[PDB]
Ligand binder design. Sequence first.
Ligand code: HEM
Ligand SMILES: CC1(C)CN(c2cc(C(F)(F)F)cc3cncn23)CC[C@]12NC(=O)NC2=O
Length: 371
Amino acid sequence: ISKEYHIDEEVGFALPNPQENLPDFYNDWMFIAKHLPDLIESGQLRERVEKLNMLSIDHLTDHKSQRLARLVLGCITMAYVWGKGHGDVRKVLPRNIAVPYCQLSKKLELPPILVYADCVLANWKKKDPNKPLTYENMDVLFSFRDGDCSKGFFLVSLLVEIAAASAIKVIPTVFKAMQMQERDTLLKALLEIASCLEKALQVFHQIHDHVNPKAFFSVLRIYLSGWKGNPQLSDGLVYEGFWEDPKEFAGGSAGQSSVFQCFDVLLGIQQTAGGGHAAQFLQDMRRYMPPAHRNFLCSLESNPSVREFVLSKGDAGLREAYDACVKALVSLRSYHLQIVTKYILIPASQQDLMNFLKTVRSTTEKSLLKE
Ligand code: HEM
Ligand SMILES: CC1(C)CN(c2cc(C(F)(F)F)cc3cncn23)CC[C@]12NC(=O)NC2=O
């Protein structure tokens, strides 16, 4: 795989070894982000941010320092807008944060809001740089509240992404085998993709250990929400010294994950095609991906479909290997569909989402050939 797509051999679409510290110039930004649970609980967060100074982003050289600052500013922004998470919101992002945020967001071709590539792909570190990438050897860089289970939610999401990312290096073999007409090579490549997607489901099971439902629903769910289609910020958020009027940006979501949209595109599931509402939502989230990953999803679409190759040829061994990749995705979205009921549907009852997810699950399951 070419380098300008920013695909790592080990962590896939995740940022390889994200740096943890900013330069001393931005030490004031760092203090608010590193002590978010304490400043919010104390009720001194919103005025600590208001007393900040205007810091120019010109001293944030290279990619990793910009991705960390975007993670820092994104977390601060979520804490300022939502506050303690009880309904008292702020509709104006002060200039001392709003100006360099959009200014830096323009340099990375990302919207000025905390996205999936921030709080998951760049929000981690190896506790021991010598040991493998296990949950016991990692930790998040920033969290919102005490006991919000953000470390479990983010690290498990990262580990599912890394597990599913080991099948990305197989994608070049799939397209080379098609143009060379190598049935045996294409056969083995598809089986390898399904094997990596089945390991991703096994990693998904870790989430029951590190995330409890009530903490996710009543705490962490608040700070991961955006201001697009949100009644609490009806017309969006004001970015002060950058925009003349409000702006509506969607909150973080795994619809912004390039891995799950890669294999939907590779397998011809065409989750973007259809013109429906769920198809438009996933095409929208592509704008929330880093530009190199946005370009990678688009390059796969320029190739002949893997689905039309297997479909035309009467090869039962090729159809079962293709369906093994499709079935692995259905197994993910089905177990994920149980996850939503445990941490959203059940906690909400004790106090459109469902319709969107099983619309994606239905489109995937209707892409099978044998069943
Ligand atoms: C931790 C590993 C997780 C992974 C790998 C994951 C994966 C995904 C993906 C790929 C999507 C886009 C739709 C589709 O392609 O399926 C999605 C959307 C969604 N997920 Fe997750 N998810 C995870 C955790 C969770 C948890 C813990 C919850 C609730 C407790 C949840 C609730 C939702 C909802 C309500 C949507 C659709 C609404 C929207 O995306 O804003 N997910 N997830
Ligand atoms: C639950 C949540 C509050 C957050 N969501 C989310 C966020 C992230 C992320 F970026 F933070 F890492 C990853 C992820 C995977 N699956 C769902 N994810 C989407 C759905 C959500 N957002 C909303 O607006 N309603 C909702 O239920």
